[PDB]
């Protein structure tokens, strides 16, 4: 069964740092592109970052450019997100999303309301 578990969230003062982790199971982790998404109160899902299979290709959204960084350990089958200089608007529930099909670059339906290959998320408050 496809399982994604997020961890590493809480309340941190503005200007601090926080490390999010996502443990994946039930599939070949090295075969899929991965994404980090967030949902803020009173707002819908918003794509944040993504990393490809080999990790060569890394992309961010505008607000997190430079402040955050994404990485993945395929040997450990885990995804990491480092969060630095946390602005007060970074408060949200964070999800680690998996792209629906392997060996592909397009990733449809990662910011959808009901996506199967997502997780429970971690609350980050600034």
């Amino acid at each position: 069964q496809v399982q994604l578990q997020e961890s590493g969230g809480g309340l941190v003062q503005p200007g601090g740092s926080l490390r999010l982790s996502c443990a994946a199971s039930g599939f070949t982790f090295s075969n899929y592109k991965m994404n980090w998404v967030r949902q803020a109160p009173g707002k819908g899902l918003e794509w944040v970052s993504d990393i490809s299979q080999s990790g060569a290709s890394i992309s961010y959204t505008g607000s997190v450019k430079g402040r955050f960084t994404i990485s993945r350990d395929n040997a450990k089958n885990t995804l990491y997100l480092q969060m630095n200089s946390l602005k007060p608007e970074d408060t949200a529930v964070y999800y680690c999303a998996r792209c629906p099909a392997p060996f592909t670059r397009d990733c449809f339906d990662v910011t959808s309301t009901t996506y199967a290959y997502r997780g429970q998320g971690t609350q980050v408050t600034v």
């Binding site: 505008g62 670059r105 339906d109 910011t111 959808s112």
Partner: protein, 228 residues
């Protein structure tokens, strides 16, 4: 012919069915089909003044446009139905900076989709008047959402419409360049993007679609004969 009389009559019936199919073949192959995409608040409903389907006519050429809206949020599966269409018409609201990154991500997803790797995209950057008013007002700043705007300069080939402000032109061409740089990374010459600036009062959209479809057909024919 080693056939019975009823077998021969069945053959004749099949022949008549084939004739009708050939007539339908001519009719079907005459008409161009377009797929209309773009989120809400973009105004994709009113782009042609001529809602699941729409017919319109431009100089003895028939266009048939489809807007799929009666489905769920996920579009991973049914989108495959539209891989024979001549063009995807993507409408983007050009005044809202809060949801423009979502439009960029959607355009990226459409552009790099496996079953949409040969379909060209006509890009309509709608609501130019609102963008111009917001830029001249100064309340909103593109730099807040796009830091790259500071280290940006207007294109050399950029055209100013008669009477305008350089800041408005800079904003417009930055918005266009975002989609263009998305579009010029995996196209490989198989499909292209045609961006346009259109307001709500604009009535030239159908002609732009006609010209873009002409170009799409020419490129497809060149590639099929293996000349490009």
């Amino acid at each position: 012919c080693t056939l019975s009389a009823e077998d021969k009559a069945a053959v004749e019936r099949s022949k008549m069915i084939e004739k009708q199919l050939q007539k339908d073949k001519q009719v079907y192959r005459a008409t161009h089909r377009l797929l209309l995409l773009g989120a809400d608040n973009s105004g994709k409903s009113t782009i042609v003044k001529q809602i699941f389907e729409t017919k319109f006519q431009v100089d003895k050429v028939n266009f048939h446009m489809f807007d799929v809206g009666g489905q769920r949020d996920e579009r991973r599966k049914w989108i495959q139905c539209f891989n024979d269409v001549t063009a995807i018409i993507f409408v983007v609201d050009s005044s809202d900076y809060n949801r423009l990154q979502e439009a960029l991500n959607d355009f990226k997803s459409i552009w790099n989709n496996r079953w949409l790797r040969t379909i060209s995209v006509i890009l309509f950057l709608n609501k130019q008047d609102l963008l111009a008013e917001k830029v001249l007002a100064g309340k909103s700043k593109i730099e807040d959402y796009f830091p790259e705007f500071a280290r940006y300069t207007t294109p050399e080939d950029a055209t100013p419409e008669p009477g305008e402000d350089p800041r408005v032109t800079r904003a417009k061409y930055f918005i266009r360049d975002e989609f263009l740089r998305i579009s010029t990374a995996s196209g490989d010459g198989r499909h292209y993007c045609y961006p346009h600036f259109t307001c709500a009062v604009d009535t030239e959209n159908a002609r732009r679609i006609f010209n873009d479809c002409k170009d799409i057909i020419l490129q497809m024919n060149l590639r099929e004969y293996n000349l490009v």
